[model samples]
Target: QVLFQGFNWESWKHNGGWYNFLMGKVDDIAAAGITHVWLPPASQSVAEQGYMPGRLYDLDASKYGNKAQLKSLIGALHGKGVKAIADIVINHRTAEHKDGRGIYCIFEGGTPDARLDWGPHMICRDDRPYADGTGNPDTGADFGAAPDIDHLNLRVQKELVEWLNWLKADIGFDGWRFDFAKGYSADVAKIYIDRSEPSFAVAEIWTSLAYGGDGKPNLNQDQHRQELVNWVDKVGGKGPATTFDFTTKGILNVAVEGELWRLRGTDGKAPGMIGWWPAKAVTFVDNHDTGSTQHMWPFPSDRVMQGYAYILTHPGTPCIFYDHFFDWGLKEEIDRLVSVRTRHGIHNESKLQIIEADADLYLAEIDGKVIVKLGPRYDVGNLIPGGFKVAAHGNDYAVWEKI
Candidate 1:
C-alpha cells in the first residue's frame, strides 16, 4: 500500500513553521514506519522584500534562512531514512519578481535574473509570432499567477537541466512533483525529464479529461494521463522515470465519493490498470490547487476518508496529506490504515481487485487476499475489521479493523 506517508506545507511558512515541522514530521512518521516525506518546494520562495507580498519566492536568499536550513531539512529526512520528495513548482515564479522579470529566462537552470516575473514562462498570446506560435489558450490562462515560461526555448531547456542537477547534486532530493507541465510541448517535456537523471518527477496535466482537438472545447484530462504513461514506457527503458496518475485520483474521487451517481450501479474497475508514468503511477486525492478533497466532493467527510483508504491501501506509492491526519486529527485513522497495508504487504506491483457489489457497499481486494469494504454515506456499522471498512450513517461514522 505505498508505504503510508506524505508532507504538504501549503500555508506553513518555509523558513519558520516548515523548517521546524520538517524535522519533527520526518522523525515522527519514520517512527510510524513511513519511508517517504513528500515536501513542498524547498527553494528560496518569495516571502520577503522586493517581491510581491505573500508571494512564494521573495526571500533575500539569506532572509528567512540560507541554503544551510534547506540542507538541514534534507539531511534530517535522510538521517531518519525517509526519502524527501520535493514539489518543484517549475510552472512560474513570483508574479512581480524582486529581480528583473523576463518573459523567457533560462527555465530549467539558475540565472542571475531567474527571480524575474514569478509565473509560468510559455508561448504568450502576445509573443506567439516570434516563437513557435501560441499553445492552447486554456493551458496558461487559468493558472492565475505568472506568465507561462517559453519551455520550447533552448535556453529554457538548459536551465531546466541545471535545476535538476542542482536538486540532485546540491540539495540531494530524491524526487520532484513537476508543476504545470502541460504548458510546454512534448519535445521540451521529454528533454527536461531526460536531463533530470535518476531522480523521480511527475508533471501536472489536468486537461486530459476532454480530448478536444484544436478549435473544439476539449477535455484532455484522460488524454494527458495517457500521454505521460506512454512517454515513460517508451523512454523509461532509456533512463529517468517520470510520470503521475491523476486519472486514477479522478476516478477514485468520483466513484468512492458517489459524486457521479450514475457510477453507483457500476463496478468501477477498469479494462486494464490505469497507468500514469507507465508502470509507476503517482496517486493522490487533493493537492494545493483544490485546497482539499473533502472541500471538493459532495459528501466531504465520507469522501475524504474513503479517498484516503483507496490511495493508502491500493497499489503505487501512496502520499498522505498532513491536513487530513494532523490538522484534522485523523492520525488514529491513518495509523489504522497503515497497519492494514503492512499486514497485507501491499507495495509496488500488487494488483487490485473488486470483490463486493454495487458502489454503495464496495470492496477492493489486494492480491485476492486482503479485502477492503466501504458503505454508503450513511451506513458504516456493517464495516468489519479483517478488512478496512468505513460506513457513514447520518452524521456518525465508524472505521474498524480485525487483524
Candidate 2:
C-alpha cells in the first residue's frame, strides 16, 4: 500500500552519464516527496538502431561503463533515502547484431547445445502463428534486432536468476519491474522471486476477460500471460506476483476516449471494471509503447494530472510513465500529490471503495476518509447533481481531508 511515484531510467545504460544526472534529479524527486526511483533494464540490452541497447552480459568495461558506475548509482540513491527499482526483461533478447552480444550469442557461443530453434534464432515471417493459430502481422519479424531467449530452457533460467540474485544480494535493489512477462515462463519468474526474497517482482501481464470453457471472468486464467501468472499464484511457492490491471485500463479508455457507457461482460451485465485478481496488479495511464501521453488523449497536456490522481489512490501499485513526468515538467506537481498521500497516511490501506465509478471520471474512498476524485475536468462545484450531494469534486480531480 506504499504509494510510490516512479520514473523510468532508460538512458542509464547507454548514456553512461546517468549516475550523476540522476543524482541531481533525485533531489527534485525527493523534494516532490517520492519514495522510490524505478529505472529501465540495467542488464545489457540489444544494440540495434531501434532495438534496446544493453542486451549483453559481458564484463567488458566499455560496454556499459562498468558495473562500478551502476553500483555507484545504487549507493548514491540509497544515500538520498530513496529506493531504486530496476526494470527486468527476461522473455527474449537481441542476438543478430553488429555488436553480437545478445542472449543467442551467450547461449550459442558458449553452449551451442543450449540453443533452441537453431534455424536462425529470428522469427522471420510477420504473420507467424501464435498459440491460438492466428497470426500477428504487426511484429517486425524480418528485422533481426535481437534474438529471443527461451525461458523454459534450464541454462537460460539459471543465468537470469544468477543476475537477479547478484543485484539483490550484492548491488541491493528495492524491487524489479518485469517486462513482457507474458512471453516468459512463470517457473522462471518464480525462481527470480524465490532468490530475490521480499524484494518486489511485478509482472507486466496485460489482463484479459476472455473465457472459452469457463463462466468466470478468468483474469489470470486466459492465455500465455494470465495463465503463467495464475499457475505461479496457485502453486504458491513464489513471492508476490503483480500484473497490469487491464480491466480498469479497458474500461477507463472507453470512458475517457470512446465516451461510451461502461463495458459489459459476455453475459450482457456490467463488467466489474476495476477488480484486480491474482491480487497484485500494476496500473498506469500510458507507457513506452502505444504512443506517448501526448498522442493518446484528445487534450494531451491535461491528461496526466487527472489520470495520475486516480492512479495514485487506486488499487494495485501505480507506475508513472517517464515521459509524462520528465518531458512535460509535471514532476513537481506529482511530488506534492504524493506528499499529501503520505501526510494523510492514505497509502497501504486495503480499504478501496468505488464510491462513484464512471467512464469520463470516477470517485473513490481510499485508506478511509481520503476522497480521491479521478479523471478529466472534475471540479468541486459539480459534486452535487440532481440534488444528490457527493463528498468529492467534479474537476478532473480533487482530494478531500486525508485520514
Candidate 3:
C-alpha cells in the first residue's frame, strides 16, 4: 500500500486547520492512488505541530483540530477506501514548564507550560554507563530536550498499550506510524501492535551513512540491512513491524545527484535494506524531517520524479510526500505512476530485474509487466522486449508496460 503524508512542516495553518484540510482532500487523495494516509500526531502536543506530545488523553483537541474534526476526517478517508495511520510519538513527553532546575525539553512554538518531565520513566543515556545500575539500558540513544521514556517500566508499558488501543478504537485510526522508533526497544512497538492489532505498523528507524573511525564512510550494505533485520526480529518479524528505508533514500539521493553507479550494491542489486527485505521496507523520497531546511535530506529537485518512478515500481511500500505532491506540482506525474503501480500489481513480492545501470541511465523490469527508466534521456532501443507502450513518462523518468 502507498502511504501519503497528509501534512508538511510548512503546511498552511488556516482557520479550518489541518483536520479540515485533510477532510477536504480525501476525495482527491483517494483518486490520486493513495491507499492510506499518515496523519501527524493527533494527541495534544507541546508544540503546534504535534510532535512533542504533552498528554496522551488530550485527543479532545490539538493544533490540527478537535476530536470531532479528526473523526470526520478519518471517516471521510475511510469512505473513500483509504485507511488513516496515526503518528504515535511516545518517545518523549513534555511537562508543564521548564524552570532550568529540572530536565527540560522544549519544542519550537510550544507553550512553556508543556515542557517534558520524565517523572519515574526516565532511562539512562546510552553514552553514559548507569552509575547505580538502575533504570533500563537505552536500546536507542539519547534524544536531547525530550526525556526518553523507560519502556522497561511496567506502568509505562501498560499505559502505552492502552493508549494505542484508544487510538485504534476511540479515535478511528486504522494503523500506526511509530515516531522515533530508535528511542526505545523494538519490543515496545511490538507490544503495542500486538495489543492494538492495527492493519499496519511502520517505525522510523533512521540509520547513519556517515564515516566511522576507519576514515572511511560506513556504507556497508549488509550492516545497514542487519540494523533493520534486528528491529524486525525483535518485533516478531515481518507482518507485525516494518521500518522506513532510510538506507534506500540515502542511496537513491546520492545516485541521482552524482554517481549512478552508487545504486549498485555489493550483492549485485539495489544498495539498501529494501533489496534484502522489501516486504518490511517503507520507501520514500522525503518527509517532514527530510524536507525541512533544519534537518533536510532533500532529494535532488531535478530527479525527484525519477526517484518516485523507482520507488513506486520497486518491491516495497512507497510513501508520497505532501510537499512534493502539492507544493512542487508533481501530483499529476505521481498520480499516474501510482496508478500504474496499482494497475500492474507492483508490490513487495513483485520481481525486479535490473536491465541497465550506469552513470547516465538506470532501467529495470518490474514484475515482468512494466519497464521503468530513469535518466536524463529515455531511449530504450531493445532493452524492453517487443517495445512496450508508455504507461507513464516524464522528465528523467518513464514507465512502459507490456503490450
Candidate 4:
C-alpha cells in the first residue's frame, strides 16, 4: 500500500484549521493514488505538532480541528477509499495537573469509561526527578520530553489497547502510525496491534545512522536493517506491523550523491531492511522530523525526487511525504511515478533483481517486468534485454515497463 505522510513538523502553524484544509484537498490526495494518510497526532499535546501529548481521549483539544471536524475529515478520506492512519504517541504522555509528587502523571479520565483515569503508576520507575512511579523500568529508549510510559504494567497496556480500539471504532481511524516506537517494547507494540486490529500499523524506530570504523557514515548496514526486521517480528506476534525503514532512508540519502553502488549490500540485495523483509518495511523519502522546518535529519533537498524514484518504483510499501508532493512542486512528477508503479502492478513484495550498482548508475528490474535506472544512466536500450517502453522518467531517473 502507498502511504502519505499528511503533515510536517511545522504543520501546527498551518492556517489554523488543518482538518478543514485537508477536507477541501481530499480529491487532490486521492488523485495521487494515496491509499492511507498518516495524519499528525490527533490527541491534545503541549507541542503544537501533537508529539507531546497530554489527553489521549480528547480529540477536540487538538489544533487540527475539533472532534466533529476530525470525524468529517476522516469520513472524507474513507469516502474516497483512502484510509486515515492516526499518529499514535503512546511512548510517553504529558499532563496538566501535577499530582502530590510534582509530576504531570495525572491523566485525564475518559468521558464514557473512566477506566483510563491513571496515576503515577503509569510512568516507568526509572524516570527519576519526573515520576516516582511504582511501575516497571522502561523497556527501550527514553523520551525525556514527557514521562516515559511503563508498558510492562498491565493497566497501562489495557488502557492503551482500549484507547487505540476506540480510535478505530469511534473516531474512524482505520490504522495506526505509532510514534517513538523505540521508547517502548516491540512486544508491547504487538499487544496493541493484535488487540486493536488496525488495518495497517507502522512504528517509527528512528535509528541512528550507521557509521564505519573511520566514523564516517557507513555505506553497508545489514545489522542496522536487521533491527527493524526483529521489531517487526515482535510486533508481528508475526500482523507483523511494518517498521519505518530508516536503514533504507539512511542509505538512500547518501547513495544519491553519485555513490549509487551503496544501494547493493555485499549479499547482492538492497542494503536496508527492504533487503531483509520488504513486506514489513515502510519506506519513505522523509517525514516531519527529517525534512521539515525542524531540519533534524533533512534528506538532501535537490535530490528529493531521486529519493522518491527509489521508493516509489522499488519494493516495500512506499510513503509519499506531503511537502515533497504538495509544497515542492513535484505533484505532477510524483503522480507520473506512482502511475507507472500501479500500472506495472508493483506491490510491497515485488521481486527486485539488481542488474548494476555503479558510482554513476544504479539499475534494477522489478518482478522481471519493470526496470528502474537511477543516476546518469541513459542507455535503457542496452539495459533491457527485450522490447520495453518508458513508463516514467524524471530529471535523473527512468522507469520502464516491458512492452
Tell me the TM-score of each prediction against the true structure: 0.71, 0.69, 0.89, 0.96
Error of 4 at 35 (Å): 0.7
Error of 1 at 216 (Å): 22
Q: Comparing 3 and 4 by lDDT, which wins?
A: 4
Candidate 1 stretches with Cα past 4 Å from truth are 1-10, 45-65, 94-144, 208-228, 231-242, 257-278, 292-299, 376-403
Residue range 130-234, candidate 1, lDDT tens digits: 123443232233234444555554554575677666766787777766666665544556676777764555556554344236532122244545566665555
lDDT assessment of candidate 3: 0.77
Candidate 3 residue lDDT tens string, 207-314: 777555864344455677688878988897746578889888877877786456566676667777778888888899999888744347778888889899999999
Candidate 2: misplaced stretches above 4 Å?
A: 1-16, 48-55, 59-66, 96-145, 207-238, 257-274, 277-279, 291-301, 358-361, 375-395
Cα lDDT for residue 3, candidate 3: 89
What are the RMSD figures for all models against the true structure? Answer: 6.7, 7.6, 4.3, 1.5
Best of the two (1, 2) by lDDT = 1
True-structure RMSD for candidate 2: 7.6
Instruction: Point to the candidate with the largest lDDT.
Output: 4
Per-residue lDDT of candidate 2, residues 229-286 (tens digit): 4644742524555655555454444444423234333333223322424246555666
The superposed Cα distance between candidate 3 and the true structure at residue 112, in angstroms, equals 22
- Which regions of candidate 3 deviate over 4 angstroms? 97-118, 121-137, 210-220, 293-295, 377-379
* Candidate 2 steric clashes: 18
**Which candidate has the top score in TM-score?**
4
After TM-score superposition, the amount by which residue 388's alpha carbon in candidate 3 deviates from its true location, in angstroms, is 1.6
